[PDB]
Amino acid sequence: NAMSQEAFENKLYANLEAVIDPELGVDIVNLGLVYDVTADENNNAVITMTMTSIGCPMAGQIVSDVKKVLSTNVPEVNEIEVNVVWNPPWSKERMSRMAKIALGIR
């Protein structure tokens, strides 16, 4: 069951690539904003993430986008909780290889 939960977590995380940070035009996964996805035996999911800055104005829109994307794209998910944390703090070092390449040019 711990391996089934892992596979569900992985599926949830991959679907978070459809959630974009509007200010950067890059998805939250490639930005490195998603710190943890965990799912219980009943497919209740907890997504722990941060924003690019405490100030970040799109925070409300990003969170509702997470719920819409997961509930729509992964219909077998049950609860969706998004916990926004500030520790450890985000930085650009957390971006993926593709994000770093894209943002060096865009």
Give an account of the 3D structure.
The protein has 106 residues and is α+β, with helices and mostly antiparallel strands. The protein has a single domain (1-106), classed as Fe-S cluster assembly (FSCA) (GMP Synthetase, Chain A, domain 3), CATH 3.30.300. Helix content is 40%, strand content 19%. The chain contains four helices and five strands; from the N terminus they run H-E-E-H-E-E-H-E-H. It has helices spanning 2-15, 28-31, 59-73, 97-105; strands spanning 20-21, 26-27, 34-39, 45-49, 80-84. The strands form two sheets. It has a three-stranded mixed sheet. A two-stranded antiparallel sheet has the order 1-2. Strand 4 (45-49), helix 3 and strand 5 form a beta-alpha-beta unit. The radius of gyration is 14 Å and the shape is globular. The termini are far apart. It is classed as unknown function. Keywords: alpha-beta fold, Structural Genomics, Center for Structural Genomics of Infectious Diseases, csgid, unknown function. The assembly is monomeric.
What are its keywords?
unknown function, MIP18 family-like domain-containing protein, Fe-S_Maturation_MIP18, FSCA_dom_sf, MIP18-like, 4 helices, three-stranded mixed beta sheet, 106 residues, globular, two-stranded antiparallel sheet, GMP Synthetase, Chain A, domain 3, alpha+beta
Please describe the biggest sheet, giving its number of strands, its sense, and whether it closes into a barrel.
Answer: 3 strands, mixed
CATH architecture: 2-Layer Sandwich
CATH topology: GMP Synthetase, Chain A, domain 3
* Total E-strand runs: 5
Structural class: alpha+beta
CATH homolog superfamily: Fe-S cluster assembly (FSCA)
Approximate helicity band: 25-40%
Order of helices and strands: HEEHEEHEH
Overall number of structural domains: 1
Query: Number of helical segments?
Result: 4
Strand order of the largest sheet: 3-4-5
Percent range for β-strand residues: 15-25%
CATH C-level class: Alpha Beta
Molecular shape: globular
